[PDB]
Amino acid sequence: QQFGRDVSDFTDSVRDPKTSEILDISPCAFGGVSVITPGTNASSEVAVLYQDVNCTDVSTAIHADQLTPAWRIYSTGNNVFQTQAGCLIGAEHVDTSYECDIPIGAGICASYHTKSIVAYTMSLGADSSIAYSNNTI
Amino acid sequence: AIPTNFSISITTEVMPVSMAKTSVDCNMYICGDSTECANLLLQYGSFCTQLNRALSGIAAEQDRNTREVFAQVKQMYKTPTLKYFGGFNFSQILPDPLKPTKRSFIEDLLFNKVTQYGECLLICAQKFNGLTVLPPLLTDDMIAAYTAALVSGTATAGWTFGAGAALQIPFAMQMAYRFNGIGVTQNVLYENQKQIANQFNKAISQIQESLTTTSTALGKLQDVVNQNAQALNTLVKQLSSNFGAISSVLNDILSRLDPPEAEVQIDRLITGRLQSLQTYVTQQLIRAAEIRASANLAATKMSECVLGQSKRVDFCGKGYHLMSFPQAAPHGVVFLHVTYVPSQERNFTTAPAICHEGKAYFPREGVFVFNGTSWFITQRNFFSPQIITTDNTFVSGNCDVVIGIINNTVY
Amino acid sequence: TVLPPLLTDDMIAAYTAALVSGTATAGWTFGAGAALQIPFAMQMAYRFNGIGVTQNVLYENQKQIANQFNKAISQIQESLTTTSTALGKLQDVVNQN
Amino acid sequence: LQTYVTQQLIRAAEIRASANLAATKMSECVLGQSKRVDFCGKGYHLMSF
Amino acid sequence: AIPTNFSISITTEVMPVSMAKTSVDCNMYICGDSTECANLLLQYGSFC
Ligand SMILES: *[C@@H]1O[C@H](CO)[C@@H](O[C@@H]2O[C@H](CO)[C@@H](O[C@@H]3O[C@H](CO)[C@@H](O)[C@H](O[C@H]4O[C@H](CO)[C@@H](O)[C@H](O)[C@@H]4O)[C@@H]3O)[C@H](O)[C@H]2NC(C)=O)[C@H](O)[C@H]1NC(C)=O
Ligand SMILES: *[C@@H]1O[C@H](CO)[C@@H](O[C@@H]2O[C@H](CO)[C@@H](O[C@@H]3O[C@H](CO)[C@@H](O)[C@H](O[C@H]4O[C@H](CO)[C@@H](O)[C@H](O)[C@@H]4O)[C@@H]3O)[C@H](O)[C@H]2NC(C)=O)[C@H](O)[C@H]1NC(C)=O
Ligand SMILES: *[C@@H]1O[C@H](CO)[C@@H](O[C@@H]2O[C@H](CO)[C@@H](O[C@@H]3O[C@H](CO)[C@@H](O)[C@H](O[C@H]4O[C@H](CO)[C@@H](O)[C@H](O)[C@@H]4O)[C@@H]3O)[C@H](O)[C@H]2NC(C)=O)[C@H](O)[C@H]1NC(C)=O
Ligand SMILES: *[C@@H]1O[C@H](CO)[C@@H](O[C@@H]2O[C@H](CO)[C@@H](O[C@@H]3O[C@H](CO)[C@@H](O)[C@H](O)[C@@H]3O)[C@H](O)[C@H]2NC(C)=O)[C@H](O)[C@H]1NC(C)=O
Ligand SMILES: *[C@@H]1O[C@H](CO)[C@@H](O[C@@H]2O[C@H](CO)[C@@H](O)[C@H](O)[C@H]2NC(C)=O)[C@H](O)[C@H]1NC(C)=O
Ligand SMILES: *[C@@H]1O[C@H](CO)[C@@H](O[C@@H]2O[C@H](CO)[C@@H](O)[C@H](O)[C@H]2NC(C)=O)[C@H](O)[C@H]1NC(C)=O
Ligand SMILES: *[C@@H]1O[C@H](CO)[C@@H](O[C@@H]2O[C@H](CO)[C@@H](O)[C@H](O)[C@H]2NC(C)=O)[C@H](O)[C@H]1NC(C)=O
Ligand SMILES: *[C@@H]1O[C@H](CO)[C@@H](O[C@@H]2O[C@H](CO)[C@@H](O)[C@H](O)[C@H]2NC(C)=O)[C@H](O)[C@H]1NC(C)=O
Ligand SMILES: *[C@@H]1O[C@H](CO)[C@@H](O[C@@H]2O[C@H](CO)[C@@H](O)[C@H](O)[C@H]2NC(C)=O)[C@H](O)[C@H]1NC(C)=O
Ligand SMILES: *[C@@H]1O[C@H](CO)[C@@H](O)[C@H](O)[C@H]1NC(C)=O
Ligand SMILES: *[C@@H]1O[C@H](CO)[C@@H](O)[C@H](O)[C@H]1NC(C)=O
Ligand SMILES: *[C@@H]1O[C@H](CO)[C@@H](O)[C@H](O)[C@H]1NC(C)=O
């Protein structure tokens, strides 16, 4: 066997022609980009969101200068938060829970609190209680 | 003919509320990130952006569908400690406190009967074609919290649940109130709470048998899956079509041909593959609207059924609707409808009015029914021989003006 | 090719004729529970009562009511015989195909 | 051929829209009694055929 | 104002529930019985 293909017809694995190692072949990387913003009338900082990509290969290639597009004025800011949707860069992960302002994915939801752009876990609603008895209305 | 007896049974109802939202990078689909690709591709101007906007607008609806359907309760309620109210056993419908799943036992039966492309599970992976499937805003856990805080609400607060703040009431109290709404006296409730509980707890175990032993009740959920499968598979399969070039491989067309013709054949390769996406965008744009039609069913079959009382026939199932309980499922909603079904009919004899004291005596409601021994007023939902008084009947005009009467007495 | 439908023309009106034959004897319980025998003016007195006019008005007037929609049934047969544009939405289904 | 199939999938979504409204009026207004205003004829609905 | 008399009436409505169901032989529509058409049909794949 020379090399392997996936369940679909692209090549994903190859036996090394000199030393017979069975490598895996993955795509190089890509993905979409969102920009999260509170509006020009409130701020002019944003947190960008690299969708569906490992944050290891995100943060390296920005330092190692391999993204197309390339930005003139841009920093990591040491705030990269691994989430289900992707790699959120620029917003501080608070471990709080408010109502969802701007959706992101899998219960993660950005907002703008006291000011900077914050990301957190969505609250569903107020935890009320109804006391229960058999004789009271 | 008027029925005597009755038997509550529970009917399941299944409907989808969202579909799997997708996205496509064009460059990793159209060619596979070659320079020879990106050369000719920019002379079409902007065409990937029109495909980016349509697949986003589909992707916004799927959250917006599931948000409106479920989040109609703005007060999340603590599930009550006792789960056995009036002899009725909600334990298989509320979330069970033992296991850390926060699902009912029945919802667990619903996932186990209906459960390529890049997707991250937090194990991420990615495919060569530009196809990807994004995760929703609302996770599976949060939906089961909304279902739990909805079953817990009407197991406590009754029909008052959706009038505003959910207002505490006994359970058998409001069960009688729903018996008024179907035109049956609530004597039938209070005098029979033992075997009503025997029937109500029997039916839920009977549906439990059904969702374990057989299948295909949730085919309307699998159908949403099978159309995501085929549209993504057929989109893949048109990569290996040539559209008139010498190859499906961009590099073979690159290698073995001169730029007088290799330009021409990969230009065929581009516009052949732009129409494969433009096909794929459109069929995703249609059945988004067929799901959005089924989404506003589930939005109205949760307000007008679970939060209130159904009056329309076969809306919320056959028979006299009493109340109904939602459950979640992967990309869908499974309902459980508690129904009132009459039985044990008897052939009696009627009279539209009775002649007594020379006057016309109409039933105020119901009918005068003569069983062969005496006359009385009862309803058609249920047999209950209420003796004809001066109060449950009424007077207008004298005797022998309406047609087909019975000469009789009024106490 | 245009394919023939599963439910033929005969079986369609076989459902409809059985449906009207039901509710001429079975009443409003024909959809809710099982079909239950009830004399026909009893159904009418009920359905008067359900719309906010008490069944005084049927029983005192069982023949004026009989005369009026027996007129109005035949007026439809006049209007279906002579004129048009009342079935346009069925034809435009046929035209657009 | 591809264009014709698209302009059939639209119209079959038009029929599927109104065949759900026909199965609803036949369930409510025939086999029962409606109380919905200016639905199933005009005036006060009695029964239907 | 309170009405004193009444009048019953029958009004009609009509709804389509169906349309004509068709099918298309893709082979015979595009080619029309030329095999040399059908040879070049196969490289376009299973579009039919
Ligand atoms: C309300 O309805 C619920 C329906 O779920 C009902 O609760 C269930 O009752 C059954 C038995 O009545 C429970 O099953 C038991 O589960 C324990 C858990 O450890 C098992 O160990 C038991 O298995 C032993 O006993 C069986 C008896 O034949 C043997 O067959 C078996 O091999 C083992 O020897 C036992 O099956 C079930 O766990 C509960 N579920 C819940 C959520 O409580 C409850 O009784 C109803 N309540 C009222 C008041 O009616
Ligand atoms: C993004 O890419 C990075 C790499 O660039 C990737 O990090 C690696 O993840 C894998 C898991 O996906 C890690 O593998 C395991 O990690 C645990 C945690 O320390 C170790 O204990 C494991 O060692 C044991 O487990 C193996 C299998 O369970 C055994 O076979 C083995 O013998 C050991 O007993 C194992 O190493 C891996 O360590 C990291 N590496 C680094 C450098 O981080 C990351 O997961 C990717 N992220 C996403 C979101 O995809
Ligand atoms: C409420 O409305 C209804 C209908 O609008 C109405 O019922 C009508 O009552 C009148 C009088 O009872 C009826 O008119 C008569 O009908 C008979 C039968 O055809 C005729 O023979 C009568 O003809 C005599 O009178 C004519 C006019 O003076 C003469 O020209 C003729 O030669 C005869 O002498 C007369 O037309 C009418 O038919 C009914 N309508 C129906 C549908 O039955 C009712 O009276 C109204 N309520 C009140 C309180 O008025
Ligand atoms: C109205 O209907 C209900 C159910 O539809 C009837 O209740 C059931 O009545 C039967 C007898 O007709 C009972 O069967 C008996 O059960 C006991 C114990 O299981 C057994 O020892 C006997 O040999 C017989 O099988 C049945 O239990 C009972 N069901 C319940 C839940 O109580 C009811 O009788 C009907 N009303 C009238 C007036 O008949
Ligand atoms: C190609 O040559 C290399 C070295 O010249 C081979 O590597 C040796 O592989 C054998 C087993 O295949 C090992 O026992 C040796 O230890 C390897 N050499 C060294 C220096 O470590 C390789 O096998 C050759 N390729 C093939 C297909 O036989
Ligand atoms: C941006 O927001 C500010 C609010 O901080 C707006 O300024 C005020 O607007 C309100 C009514 O919109 C006026 O009553 C105030 O007098 C405004 N204050 C000032 C200092 O201008 C501002 O108009 C907004 N601009 C845009 C483009 O949205
Ligand atoms: C009426 O009954 C309700 C039942 O919950 C009582 O409500 C709770 O009462 C506790 C203490 O009694 C408070 O800490 C909670 O905040 C109350 N919850 C709600 C939703 O009101 C309530 O106190 C009772 N009121 C009276 C006047 O007896
Ligand atoms: C309904 O619940 C109440 C609890 O509030 C139960 O009432 C208590 O019953 C016990 C014995 O059953 C008595 O010792 C208490 O004095 C009662 N307290 C009150 C406030 O009533 C009642 O038993 C329950 N109903 C039924 C039918 O069991
Ligand atoms: C017809 O209904 C009457 C009541 O409306 C029944 O008469 C009762 O019969 C029971 C037992 O036979 C007596 O205890 C009551 O005193 C009777 N009441 C009256 C008002 O008559 C009669 O039994 C019914 N007939 C049938 C065949 O069921
Ligand atoms: C009693 O009712 C049933 C069902 O409607 C009918 O089949 C039977 O003939 C009736 N018996 C009498 C005596 O009317
Ligand atoms: C009922 O019908 C019978 C004939 O079937 C008839 O003799 C009788 O007069 C009718 N009664 C009424 C009140 O219409
Ligand atoms: C009822 O019987 C009385 C005799 O006690 C008679 O005068 C009257 O006319 C009768 N009514 C009918 C409607 O038969």
Author numbering:
A (entry chain A): 549 to 662, 672 to 694
B (entry chain B): 695 to 809, 818 to 823, 831 to 1120
C (entry chain C): 841 to 937
D (entry chain C): 986 to 1034
E (entry chain C): 695 to 742
Passage from the reporting paper:
Coronaviruses are enveloped viruses possessing large, trimeric spike glycoproteins (S) required for the recognition of host receptors for many coronaviruses as well as the fusion of viral and host cell membranes for viral entry into cells. The S1 subunit is responsible for host-receptor binding while the S2 subunit contains the membrane-fusion machinery.
The trimeric SARS-CoV S 2P adopts two distinct conformations related to each of the S1 RBD: ‘up’ and ‘down’. The ‘down’ conformation caps the S2 helices and makes extensive contacts with the S1 NTD. The ‘up’ conformation of the S1 RBD exposes the S1 RBD receptor-binding site.
